[PDB]
Each structure stands twice: as C-alpha cells, then as structure tokens.
Amino acid sequence: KAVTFYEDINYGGASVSLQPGNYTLSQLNTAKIPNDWMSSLKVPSGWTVDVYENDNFTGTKWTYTSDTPWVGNDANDKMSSVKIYST
C-alpha cells in the first residue's frame, strides 16, 4: 500500500510512490517529484491525500480519497506540498 503520483494524465509518464507523511516541496524534490508536475495519482482505498498548491501545506487544498486518473485543470501541475494519511 502506497500513494503513487504520476507525471501525466491516465497514470502516464514518470511515477513516484510515497508512504503516509507530510511532504514539503524540498522533500518531494528529493523523492524525485518536481514542483508543478502531478497530473494523476493512485490512492489506496481508505486513505486520504491532501494536495496543496503552495509549499508547507498552504494555498489551495485538493483532497483525494481514491484513484484519480485526472485531477482536472484546476489542480493539474500545482502540487507543491502534500499530506498523506492512512485514514
């Protein structure tokens, strides 16, 4: 069980998996997730992913609780920090 973030729509391009936690921009970058990059993600059923527009869990928040082949044009390429919960 992990969250996998994808570069492109429909789980395309580069992908990186992360365990529960609170990831800043620099921490995402270390994990090989660039800024303004996430377009789709897989979420284990039961889990919650809070995707933030700005670093340090600020700016607009989008919430995902299931596999999302397309985040939509509002949330697309905006993830700069993220909180992942196994609940």
Next chain:
Amino acid sequence: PTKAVTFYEDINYGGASVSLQPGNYTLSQLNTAKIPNDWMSSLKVPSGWTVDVYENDNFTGTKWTYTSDTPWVGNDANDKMSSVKIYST
C-alpha cells in the same frame, strides 16, 4: 507522571533509552532530551496513546504511527526518527 513513551537505541528494547511525556518534539529538542538523530529502533507505548514518528525534522517526511509496544520498527523506519508527536489520547 510515571506513564511515558520510552524510546530505545537498539532492537528489542536494547541499549540506551529515553522517556518522554506527550508533546511535539523537534530534532533539537530530542537531542536536548538525549535522543540523537537517526537512532530509534524500538519503543514502548502506553495503552490509548499515539506516537507519530517522523523521518524529518518539524513533523515532516514519512510518518510512522505506533499505538502499542513495538520491539522492532522495521528496517524502513529504523534509525530515522528526527521528530516526534506523542498524544495521550
């Protein structure tokens, strides 16, 4: 208080240990309490308590959650505690 979370240097509650009350402890604060970085390998948790262990300082990076006595955190979580939140409920 006598009830506390006890963190251990080695697997199976081995080596040096440090007990902490509920709170939110950064890296420097852990160090002050005599817990070095990347050091924790096992821990004891009072019933009803929650321990959120964080890979990085300031409660960021991967988070491992413990609600019971844990003789071994696992190789992925091993020697990676850099900050921690302890809850009494």
